[PDB]
mmCIF file of C-alpha atoms and ligand atoms in Angstrom:
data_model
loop_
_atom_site.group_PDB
_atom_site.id
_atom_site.type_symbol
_atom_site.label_atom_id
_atom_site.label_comp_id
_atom_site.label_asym_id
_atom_site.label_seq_id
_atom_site.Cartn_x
_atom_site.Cartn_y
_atom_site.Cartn_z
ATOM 1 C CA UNK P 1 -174.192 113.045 46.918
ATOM 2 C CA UNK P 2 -177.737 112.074 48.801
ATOM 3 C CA UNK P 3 -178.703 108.770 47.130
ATOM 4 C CA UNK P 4 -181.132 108.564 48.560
ATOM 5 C CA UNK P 5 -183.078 112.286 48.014
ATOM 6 C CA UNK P 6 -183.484 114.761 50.797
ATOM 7 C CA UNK P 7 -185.699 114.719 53.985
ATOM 8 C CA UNK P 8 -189.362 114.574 53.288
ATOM 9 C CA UNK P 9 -192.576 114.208 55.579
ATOM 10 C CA UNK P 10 -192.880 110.808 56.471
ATOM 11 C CA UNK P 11 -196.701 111.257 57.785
ATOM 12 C CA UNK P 12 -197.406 112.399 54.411
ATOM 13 C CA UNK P 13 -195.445 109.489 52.860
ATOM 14 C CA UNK P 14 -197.605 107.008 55.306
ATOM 15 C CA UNK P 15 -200.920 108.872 53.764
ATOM 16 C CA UNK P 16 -200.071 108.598 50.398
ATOM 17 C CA UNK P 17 -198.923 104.935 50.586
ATOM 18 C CA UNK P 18 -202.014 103.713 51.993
ATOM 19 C CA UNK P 19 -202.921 101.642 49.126
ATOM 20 C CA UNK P 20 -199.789 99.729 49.809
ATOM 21 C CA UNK P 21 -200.144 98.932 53.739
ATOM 22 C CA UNK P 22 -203.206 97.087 53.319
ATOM 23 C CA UNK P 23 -203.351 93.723 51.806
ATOM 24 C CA UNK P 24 -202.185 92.202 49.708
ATOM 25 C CA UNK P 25 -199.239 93.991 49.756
ATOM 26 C CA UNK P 26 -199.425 95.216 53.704
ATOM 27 C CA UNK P 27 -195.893 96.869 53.466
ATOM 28 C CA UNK P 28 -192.976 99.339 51.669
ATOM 29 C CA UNK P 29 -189.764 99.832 51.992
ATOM 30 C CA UNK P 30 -188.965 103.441 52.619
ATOM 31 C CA UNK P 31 -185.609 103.554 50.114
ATOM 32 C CA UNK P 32 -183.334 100.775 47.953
ATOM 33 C CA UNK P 33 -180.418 99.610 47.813
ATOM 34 C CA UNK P 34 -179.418 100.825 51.475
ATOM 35 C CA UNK P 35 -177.849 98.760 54.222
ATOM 36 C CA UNK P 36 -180.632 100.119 56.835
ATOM 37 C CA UNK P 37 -183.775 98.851 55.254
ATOM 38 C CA UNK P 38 -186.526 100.921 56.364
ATOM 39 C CA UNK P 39 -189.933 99.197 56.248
ATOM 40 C CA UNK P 40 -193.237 101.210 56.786
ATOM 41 C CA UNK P 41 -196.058 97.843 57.676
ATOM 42 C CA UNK P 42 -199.032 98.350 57.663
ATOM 43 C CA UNK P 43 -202.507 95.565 57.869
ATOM 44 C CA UNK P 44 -204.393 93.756 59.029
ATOM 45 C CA UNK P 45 -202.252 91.072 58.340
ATOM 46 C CA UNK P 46 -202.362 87.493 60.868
ATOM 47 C CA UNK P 47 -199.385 85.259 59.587
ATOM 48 C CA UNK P 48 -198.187 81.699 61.787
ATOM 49 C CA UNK P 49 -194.384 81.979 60.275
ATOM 50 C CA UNK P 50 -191.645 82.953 63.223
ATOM 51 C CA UNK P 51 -188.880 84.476 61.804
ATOM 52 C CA UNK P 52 -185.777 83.713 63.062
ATOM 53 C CA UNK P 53 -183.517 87.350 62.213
ATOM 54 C CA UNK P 54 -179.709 87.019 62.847
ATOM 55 C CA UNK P 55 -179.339 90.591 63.157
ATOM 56 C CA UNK P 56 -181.765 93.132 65.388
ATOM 57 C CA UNK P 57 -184.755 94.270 64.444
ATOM 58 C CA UNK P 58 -186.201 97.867 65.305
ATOM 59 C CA UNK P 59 -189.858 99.009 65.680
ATOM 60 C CA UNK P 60 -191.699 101.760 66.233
ATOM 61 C CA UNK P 61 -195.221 101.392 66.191
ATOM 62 C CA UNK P 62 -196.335 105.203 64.825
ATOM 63 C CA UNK P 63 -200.144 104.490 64.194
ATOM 64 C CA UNK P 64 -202.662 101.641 65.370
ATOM 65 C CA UNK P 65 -201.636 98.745 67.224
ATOM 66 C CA UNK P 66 -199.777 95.082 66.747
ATOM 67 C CA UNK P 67 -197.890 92.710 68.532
ATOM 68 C CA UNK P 68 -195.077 90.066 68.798
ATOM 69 C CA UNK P 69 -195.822 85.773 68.962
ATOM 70 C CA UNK P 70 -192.435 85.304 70.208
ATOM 71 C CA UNK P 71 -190.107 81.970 72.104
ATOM 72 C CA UNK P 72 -188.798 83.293 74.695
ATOM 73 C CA UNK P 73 -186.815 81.334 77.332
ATOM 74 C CA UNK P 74 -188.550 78.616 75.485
ATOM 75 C CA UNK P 75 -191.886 79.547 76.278
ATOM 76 C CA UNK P 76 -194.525 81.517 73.987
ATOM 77 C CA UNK P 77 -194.889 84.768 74.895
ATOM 78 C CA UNK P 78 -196.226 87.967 73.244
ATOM 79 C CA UNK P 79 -194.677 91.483 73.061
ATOM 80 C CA UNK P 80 -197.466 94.263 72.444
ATOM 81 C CA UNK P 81 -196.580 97.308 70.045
ATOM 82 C CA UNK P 82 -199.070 99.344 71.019
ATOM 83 C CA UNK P 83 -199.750 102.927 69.505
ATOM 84 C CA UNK P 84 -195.992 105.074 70.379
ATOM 85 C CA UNK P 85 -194.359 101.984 71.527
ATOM 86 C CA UNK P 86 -190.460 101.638 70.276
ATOM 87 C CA UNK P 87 -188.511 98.172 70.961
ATOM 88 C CA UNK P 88 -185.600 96.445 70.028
ATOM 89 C CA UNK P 89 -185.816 92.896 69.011
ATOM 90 C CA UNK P 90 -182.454 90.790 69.846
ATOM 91 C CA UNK P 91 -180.737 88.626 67.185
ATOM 92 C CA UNK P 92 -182.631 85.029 66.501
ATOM 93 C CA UNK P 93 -185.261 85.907 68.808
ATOM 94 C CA UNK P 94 -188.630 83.895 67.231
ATOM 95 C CA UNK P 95 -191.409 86.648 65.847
ATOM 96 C CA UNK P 96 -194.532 86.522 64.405
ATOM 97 C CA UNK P 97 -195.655 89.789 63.701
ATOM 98 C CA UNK P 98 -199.794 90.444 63.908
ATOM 99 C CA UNK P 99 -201.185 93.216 62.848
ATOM 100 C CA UNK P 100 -205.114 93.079 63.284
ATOM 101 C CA UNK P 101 -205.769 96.881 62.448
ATOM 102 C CA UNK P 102 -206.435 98.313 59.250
ATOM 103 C CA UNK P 103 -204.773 101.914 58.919
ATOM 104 C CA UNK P 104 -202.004 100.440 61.471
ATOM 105 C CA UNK P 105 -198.549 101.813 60.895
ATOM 106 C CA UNK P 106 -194.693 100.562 61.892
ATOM 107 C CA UNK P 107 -191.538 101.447 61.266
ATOM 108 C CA UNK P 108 -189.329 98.720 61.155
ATOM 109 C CA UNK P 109 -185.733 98.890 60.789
ATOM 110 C CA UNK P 110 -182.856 96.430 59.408
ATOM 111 C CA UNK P 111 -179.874 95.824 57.840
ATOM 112 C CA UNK P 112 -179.137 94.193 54.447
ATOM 113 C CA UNK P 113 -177.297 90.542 55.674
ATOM 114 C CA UNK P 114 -174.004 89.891 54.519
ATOM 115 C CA UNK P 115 -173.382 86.949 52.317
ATOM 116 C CA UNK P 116 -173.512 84.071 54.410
ATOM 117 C CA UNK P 117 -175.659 84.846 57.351
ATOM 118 C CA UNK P 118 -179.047 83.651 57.012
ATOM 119 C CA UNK P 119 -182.376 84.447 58.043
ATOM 120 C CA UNK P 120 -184.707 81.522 59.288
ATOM 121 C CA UNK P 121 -188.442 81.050 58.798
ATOM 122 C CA UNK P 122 -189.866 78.238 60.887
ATOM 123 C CA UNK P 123 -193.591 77.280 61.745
ATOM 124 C CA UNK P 124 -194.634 74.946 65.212
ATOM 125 C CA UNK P 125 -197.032 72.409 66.232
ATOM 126 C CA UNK P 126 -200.093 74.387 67.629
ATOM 127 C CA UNK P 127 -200.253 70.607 69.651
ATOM 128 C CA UNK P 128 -197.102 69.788 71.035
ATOM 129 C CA UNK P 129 -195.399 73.349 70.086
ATOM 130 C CA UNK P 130 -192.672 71.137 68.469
ATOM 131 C CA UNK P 131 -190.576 72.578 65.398
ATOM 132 C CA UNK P 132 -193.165 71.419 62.236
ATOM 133 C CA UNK P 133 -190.758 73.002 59.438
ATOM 134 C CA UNK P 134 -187.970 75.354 58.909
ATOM 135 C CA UNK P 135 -186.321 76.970 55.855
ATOM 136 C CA UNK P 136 -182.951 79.133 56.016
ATOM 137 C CA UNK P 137 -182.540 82.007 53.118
ATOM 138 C CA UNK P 138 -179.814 84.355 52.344
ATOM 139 C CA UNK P 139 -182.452 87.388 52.106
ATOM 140 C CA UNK P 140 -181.795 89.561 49.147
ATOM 141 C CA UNK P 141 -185.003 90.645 48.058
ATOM 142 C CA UNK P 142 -187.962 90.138 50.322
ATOM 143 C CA UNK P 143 -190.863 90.258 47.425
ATOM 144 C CA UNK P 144 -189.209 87.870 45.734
ATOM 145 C CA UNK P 145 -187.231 85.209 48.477
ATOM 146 C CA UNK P 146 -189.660 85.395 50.721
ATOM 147 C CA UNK P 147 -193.462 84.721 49.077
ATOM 148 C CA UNK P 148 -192.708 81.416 47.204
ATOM 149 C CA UNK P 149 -190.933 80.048 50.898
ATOM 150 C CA UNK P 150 -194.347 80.321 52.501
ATOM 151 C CA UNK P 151 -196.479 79.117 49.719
ATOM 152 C CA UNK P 152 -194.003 75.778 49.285
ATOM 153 C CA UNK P 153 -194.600 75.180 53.211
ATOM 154 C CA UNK P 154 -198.916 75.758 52.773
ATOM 155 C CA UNK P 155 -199.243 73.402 50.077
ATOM 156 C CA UNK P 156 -197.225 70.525 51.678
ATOM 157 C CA UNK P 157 -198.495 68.223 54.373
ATOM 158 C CA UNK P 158 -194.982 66.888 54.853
ATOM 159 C CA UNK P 159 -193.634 70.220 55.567
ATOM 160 C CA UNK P 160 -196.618 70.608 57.886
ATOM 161 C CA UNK P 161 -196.323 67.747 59.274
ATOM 162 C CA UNK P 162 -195.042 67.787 62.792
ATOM 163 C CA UNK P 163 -192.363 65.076 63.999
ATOM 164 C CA UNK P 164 -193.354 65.043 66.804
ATOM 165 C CA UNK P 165 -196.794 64.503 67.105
ATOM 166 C CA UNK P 166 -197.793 64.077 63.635
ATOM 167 C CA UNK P 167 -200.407 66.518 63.660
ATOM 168 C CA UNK P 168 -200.316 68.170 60.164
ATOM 169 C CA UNK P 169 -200.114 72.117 60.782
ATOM 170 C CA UNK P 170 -202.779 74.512 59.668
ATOM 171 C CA UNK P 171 -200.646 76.335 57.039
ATOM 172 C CA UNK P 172 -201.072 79.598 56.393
ATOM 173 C CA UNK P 173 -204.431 80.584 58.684
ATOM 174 C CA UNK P 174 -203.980 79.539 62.447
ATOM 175 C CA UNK U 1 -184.888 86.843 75.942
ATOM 176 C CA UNK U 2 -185.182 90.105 75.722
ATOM 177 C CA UNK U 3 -182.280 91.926 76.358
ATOM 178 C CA UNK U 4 -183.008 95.158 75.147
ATOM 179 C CA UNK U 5 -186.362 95.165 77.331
ATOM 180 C CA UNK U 6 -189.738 95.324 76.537
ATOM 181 C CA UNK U 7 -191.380 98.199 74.115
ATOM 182 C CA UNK U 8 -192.346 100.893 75.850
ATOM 183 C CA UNK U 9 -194.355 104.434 75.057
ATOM 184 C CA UNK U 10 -191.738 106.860 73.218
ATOM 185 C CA UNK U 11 -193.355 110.001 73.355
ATOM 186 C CA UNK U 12 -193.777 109.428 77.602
ATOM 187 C CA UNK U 13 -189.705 108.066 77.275
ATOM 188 C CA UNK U 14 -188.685 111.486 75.253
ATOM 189 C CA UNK U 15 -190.895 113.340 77.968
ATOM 190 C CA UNK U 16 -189.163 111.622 80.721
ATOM 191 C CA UNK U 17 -185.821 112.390 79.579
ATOM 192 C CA UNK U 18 -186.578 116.197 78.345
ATOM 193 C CA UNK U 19 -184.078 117.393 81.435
ATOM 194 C CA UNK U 20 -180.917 115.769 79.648
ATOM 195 C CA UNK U 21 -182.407 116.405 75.853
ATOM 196 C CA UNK U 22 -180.980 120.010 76.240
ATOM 197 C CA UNK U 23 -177.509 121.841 77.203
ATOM 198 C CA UNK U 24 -175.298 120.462 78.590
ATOM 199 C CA UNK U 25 -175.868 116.588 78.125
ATOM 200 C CA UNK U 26 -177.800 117.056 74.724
ATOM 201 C CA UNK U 27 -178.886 113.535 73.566
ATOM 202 C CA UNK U 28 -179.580 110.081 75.378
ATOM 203 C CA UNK U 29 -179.173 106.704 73.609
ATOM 204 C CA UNK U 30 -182.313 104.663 74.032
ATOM 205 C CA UNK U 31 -180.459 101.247 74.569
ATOM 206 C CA UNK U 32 -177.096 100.017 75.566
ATOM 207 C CA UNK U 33 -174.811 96.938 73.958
ATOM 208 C CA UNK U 34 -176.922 96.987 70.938
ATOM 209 C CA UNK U 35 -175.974 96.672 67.266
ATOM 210 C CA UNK U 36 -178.327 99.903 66.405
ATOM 211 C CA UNK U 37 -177.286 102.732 68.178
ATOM 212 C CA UNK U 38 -180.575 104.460 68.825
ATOM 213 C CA UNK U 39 -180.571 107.962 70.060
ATOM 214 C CA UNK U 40 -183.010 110.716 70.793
ATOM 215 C CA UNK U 41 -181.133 114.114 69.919
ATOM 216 C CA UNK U 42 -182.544 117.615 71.672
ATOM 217 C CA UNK U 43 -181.375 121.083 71.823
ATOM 218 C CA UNK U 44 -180.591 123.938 71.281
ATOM 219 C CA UNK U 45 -176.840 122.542 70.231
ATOM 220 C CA UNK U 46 -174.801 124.381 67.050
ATOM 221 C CA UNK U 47 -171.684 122.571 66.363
ATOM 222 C CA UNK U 48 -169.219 123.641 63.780
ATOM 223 C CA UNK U 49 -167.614 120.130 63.143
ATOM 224 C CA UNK U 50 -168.367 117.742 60.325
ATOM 225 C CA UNK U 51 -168.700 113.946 60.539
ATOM 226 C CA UNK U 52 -167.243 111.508 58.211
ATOM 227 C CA UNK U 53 -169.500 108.314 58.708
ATOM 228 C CA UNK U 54 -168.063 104.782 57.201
ATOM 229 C CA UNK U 55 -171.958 104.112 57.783
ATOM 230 C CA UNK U 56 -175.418 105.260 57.209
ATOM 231 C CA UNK U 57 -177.368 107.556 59.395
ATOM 232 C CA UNK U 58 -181.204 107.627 59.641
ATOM 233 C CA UNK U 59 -182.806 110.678 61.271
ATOM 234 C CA UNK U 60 -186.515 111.198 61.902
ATOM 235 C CA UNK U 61 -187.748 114.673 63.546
ATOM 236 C CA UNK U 62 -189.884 113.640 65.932
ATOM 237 C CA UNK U 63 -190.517 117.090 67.401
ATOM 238 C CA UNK U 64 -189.166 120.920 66.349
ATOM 239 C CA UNK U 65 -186.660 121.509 63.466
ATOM 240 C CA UNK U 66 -183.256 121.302 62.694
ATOM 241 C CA UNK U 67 -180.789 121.324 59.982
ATOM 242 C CA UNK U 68 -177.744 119.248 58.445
ATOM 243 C CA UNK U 69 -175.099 121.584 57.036
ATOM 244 C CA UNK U 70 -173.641 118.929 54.719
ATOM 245 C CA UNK U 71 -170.590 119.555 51.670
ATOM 246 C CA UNK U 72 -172.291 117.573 48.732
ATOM 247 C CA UNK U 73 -170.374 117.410 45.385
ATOM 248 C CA UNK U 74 -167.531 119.782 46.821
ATOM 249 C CA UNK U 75 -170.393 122.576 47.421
ATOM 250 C CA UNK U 76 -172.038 123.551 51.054
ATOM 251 C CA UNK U 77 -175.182 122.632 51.274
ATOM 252 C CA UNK U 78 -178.081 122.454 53.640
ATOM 253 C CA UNK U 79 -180.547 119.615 54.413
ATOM 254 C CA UNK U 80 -183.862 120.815 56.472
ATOM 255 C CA UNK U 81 -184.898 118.482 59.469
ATOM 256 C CA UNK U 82 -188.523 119.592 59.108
ATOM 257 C CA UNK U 83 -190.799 118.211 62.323
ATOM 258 C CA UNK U 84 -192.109 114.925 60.128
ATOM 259 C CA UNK U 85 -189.089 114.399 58.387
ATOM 260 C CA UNK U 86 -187.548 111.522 58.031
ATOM 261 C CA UNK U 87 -183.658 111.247 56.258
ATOM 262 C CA UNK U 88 -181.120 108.182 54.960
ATOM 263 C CA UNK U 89 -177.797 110.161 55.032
ATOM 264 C CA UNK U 90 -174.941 107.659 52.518
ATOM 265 C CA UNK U 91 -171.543 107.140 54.278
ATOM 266 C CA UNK U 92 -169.342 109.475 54.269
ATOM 267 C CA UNK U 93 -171.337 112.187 53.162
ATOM 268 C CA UNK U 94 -169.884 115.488 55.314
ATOM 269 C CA UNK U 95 -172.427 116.494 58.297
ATOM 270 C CA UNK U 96 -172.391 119.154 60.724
ATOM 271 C CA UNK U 97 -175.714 118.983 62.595
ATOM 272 C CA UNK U 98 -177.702 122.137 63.771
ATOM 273 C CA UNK U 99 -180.400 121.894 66.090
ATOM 274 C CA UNK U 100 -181.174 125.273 67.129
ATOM 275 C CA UNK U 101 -184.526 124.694 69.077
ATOM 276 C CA UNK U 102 -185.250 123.737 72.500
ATOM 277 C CA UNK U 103 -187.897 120.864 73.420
ATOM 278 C CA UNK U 104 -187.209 119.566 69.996
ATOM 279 C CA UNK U 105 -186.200 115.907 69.864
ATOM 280 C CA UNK U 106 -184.846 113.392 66.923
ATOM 281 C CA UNK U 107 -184.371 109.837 66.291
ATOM 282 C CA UNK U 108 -181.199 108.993 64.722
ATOM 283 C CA UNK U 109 -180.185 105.267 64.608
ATOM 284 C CA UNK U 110 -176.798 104.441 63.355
ATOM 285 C CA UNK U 111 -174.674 101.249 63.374
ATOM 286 C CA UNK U 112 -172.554 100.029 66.103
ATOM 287 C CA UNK U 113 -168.535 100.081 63.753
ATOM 288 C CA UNK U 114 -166.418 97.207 63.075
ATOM 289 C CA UNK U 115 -162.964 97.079 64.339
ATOM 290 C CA UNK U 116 -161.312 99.218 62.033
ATOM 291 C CA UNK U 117 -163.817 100.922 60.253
ATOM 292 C CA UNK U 118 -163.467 104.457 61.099
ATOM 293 C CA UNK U 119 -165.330 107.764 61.987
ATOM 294 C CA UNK U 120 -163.801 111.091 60.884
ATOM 295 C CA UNK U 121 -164.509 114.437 62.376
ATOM 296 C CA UNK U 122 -163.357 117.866 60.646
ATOM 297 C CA UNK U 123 -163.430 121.094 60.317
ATOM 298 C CA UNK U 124 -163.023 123.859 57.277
ATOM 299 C CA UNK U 125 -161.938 127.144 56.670
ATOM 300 C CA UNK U 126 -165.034 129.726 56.514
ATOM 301 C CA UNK U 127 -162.589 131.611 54.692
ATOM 302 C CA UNK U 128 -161.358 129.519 51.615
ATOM 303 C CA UNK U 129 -163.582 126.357 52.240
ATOM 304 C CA UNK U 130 -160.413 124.032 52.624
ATOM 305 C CA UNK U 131 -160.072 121.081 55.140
ATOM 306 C CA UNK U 132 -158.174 122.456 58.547
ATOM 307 C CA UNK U 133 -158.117 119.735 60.480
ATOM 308 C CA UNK U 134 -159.328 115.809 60.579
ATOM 309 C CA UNK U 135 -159.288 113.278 63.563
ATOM 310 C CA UNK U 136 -160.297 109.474 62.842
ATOM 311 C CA UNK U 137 -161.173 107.367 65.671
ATOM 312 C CA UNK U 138 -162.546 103.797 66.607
ATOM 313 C CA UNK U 139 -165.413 105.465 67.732
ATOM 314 C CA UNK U 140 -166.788 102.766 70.689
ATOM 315 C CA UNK U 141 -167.943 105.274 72.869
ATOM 316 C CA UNK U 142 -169.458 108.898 72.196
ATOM 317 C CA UNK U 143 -169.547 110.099 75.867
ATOM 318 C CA UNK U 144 -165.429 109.247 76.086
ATOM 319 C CA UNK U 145 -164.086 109.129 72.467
ATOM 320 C CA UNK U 146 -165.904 112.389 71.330
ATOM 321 C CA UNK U 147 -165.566 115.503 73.276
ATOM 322 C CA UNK U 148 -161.949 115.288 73.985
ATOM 323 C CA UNK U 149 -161.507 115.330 70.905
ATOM 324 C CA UNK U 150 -163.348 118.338 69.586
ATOM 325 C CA UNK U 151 -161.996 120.267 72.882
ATOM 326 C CA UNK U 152 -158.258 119.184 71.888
ATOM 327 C CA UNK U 153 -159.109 121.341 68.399
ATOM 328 C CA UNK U 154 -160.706 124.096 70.313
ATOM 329 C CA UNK U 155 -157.566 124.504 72.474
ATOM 330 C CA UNK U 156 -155.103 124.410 69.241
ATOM 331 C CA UNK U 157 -154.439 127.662 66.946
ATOM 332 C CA UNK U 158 -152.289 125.177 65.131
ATOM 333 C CA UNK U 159 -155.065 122.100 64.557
ATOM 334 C CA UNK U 160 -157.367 125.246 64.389
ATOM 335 C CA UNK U 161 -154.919 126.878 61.556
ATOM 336 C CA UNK U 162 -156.067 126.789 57.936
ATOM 337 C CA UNK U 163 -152.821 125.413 55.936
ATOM 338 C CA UNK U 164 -154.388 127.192 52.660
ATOM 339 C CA UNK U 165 -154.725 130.836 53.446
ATOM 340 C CA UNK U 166 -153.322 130.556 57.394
ATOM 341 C CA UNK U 167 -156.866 131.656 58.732
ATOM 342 C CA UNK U 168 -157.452 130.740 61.815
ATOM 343 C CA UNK U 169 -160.545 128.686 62.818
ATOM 344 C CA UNK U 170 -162.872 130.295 65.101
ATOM 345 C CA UNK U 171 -163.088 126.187 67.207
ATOM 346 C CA UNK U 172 -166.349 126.286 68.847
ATOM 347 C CA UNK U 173 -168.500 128.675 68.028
ATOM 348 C CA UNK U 174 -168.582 129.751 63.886
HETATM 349 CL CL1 LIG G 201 -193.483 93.392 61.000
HETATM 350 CL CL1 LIG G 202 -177.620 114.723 65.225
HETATM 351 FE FE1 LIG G 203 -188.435 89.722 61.348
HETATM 352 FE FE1 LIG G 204 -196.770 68.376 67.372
HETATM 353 FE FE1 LIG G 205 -173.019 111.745 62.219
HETATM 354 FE FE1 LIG G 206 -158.603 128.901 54.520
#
């Protein structure tokens, strides 16, 4: 049978969700317990954690504006998601999502990871752009696995604490 | 890097690629190689087949309507593609997809299939409801593993025969 329920307007789901894509929750997941998981996110939310995603990532930016921090080539560089834009994000490609706007808007597409293949969350030196901290998780539940990894990283300087150049990283504001 | 490209404007991509979102080419996958198969589906197009997907399929009706003649606890039914709709179809639930409007265009992203995972495609009696024919395939390519496929039933009273009252299927058009 449909598990999960029949079609339904998803410009009147976005409306009456808006509550939910504003801080401090900023996102929901469309339906549970799928392998696709269909995220709606919305803002503003700034964040300085690249996640490291070993499977692709689809957006499709259906109201306001965001963009991308990403390493590419070894090299920051940003990807915009402007208003209508669609894009495909590779496996392990670095992203930091932004999403200045209030009222902003973006599907994002995944797929549940199989036991085994983890997802990485990493932070850099805003000095030397040297690799401060990373954490690996088998991603299960993102409300739960994902909050207390962040908060563990902002209130230790040694996780902040870059290697490299031993300048102590901002945390969770740039 | 970025191997699937850069995002770009949808709308101005679906606009762009109106000439092949109609009779006789139909749909146009947005990017090649890629895990998520992401295509933009136009019309008109009335099919009388039925997928079997070992995967999920996610639809959204970006523009016009359409339908999904599905067979949900042994029992025809119909799900509307309303423009705004958005849809998380389970594997293996029966689909035959109608999309009886011209300039009408949706996203459906599926998954690329393992190495012996399977797609079926078949076809039932309008007569007595029961299963005339079923094909699996590898399916690895739609443009080459597809339409010989539903042409090879087409050109067969025998694939086309109903083995429960001997009615013969009408093949292409219901
Ligand atoms: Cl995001
Ligand atoms: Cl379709
Ligand atoms: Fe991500
Ligand atoms: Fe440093
Ligand atoms: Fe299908
Ligand atoms: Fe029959």
């Amino acid at each position: 049978m449909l598990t999960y329920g029949a079609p339904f307007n998803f410009p009147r789901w976005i409306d009456e969700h808006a509550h939910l894509l504003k801080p401090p929750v900023g996102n929901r997941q469309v339906w549970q317990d799928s392998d696709f998981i269909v995220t709606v996110v919305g803002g503003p939310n700034h964040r300085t954690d690249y996640h490291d995603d070993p499977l692709e990532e689809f957006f499709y930016q259906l109201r306001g504006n965001a963009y991308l921090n990403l390493w590419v080539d070894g090299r920051r560089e940003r990807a915009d998601l402007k208003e209508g834009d669609i894009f495909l994000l590779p496996p392990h490609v670095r992203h930091s999502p932004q999403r200045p706007e209030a009222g902003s808007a973006c599907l994002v597409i995944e797929r549940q990871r199989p036991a085994g293949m983890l997802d990485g969350f990493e932070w850099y030196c805003d000095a030397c752009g040297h690799l401060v901290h990373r954490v690996e998780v088998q991603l299960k539940s993102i409300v739960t696995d994902l909050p207390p990894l962040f908060e563990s990283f902002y209130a230790s300087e040694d996780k902040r604490r870059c290697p490299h150049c031993g300048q102590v990283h901002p945390g969770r504001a740039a």
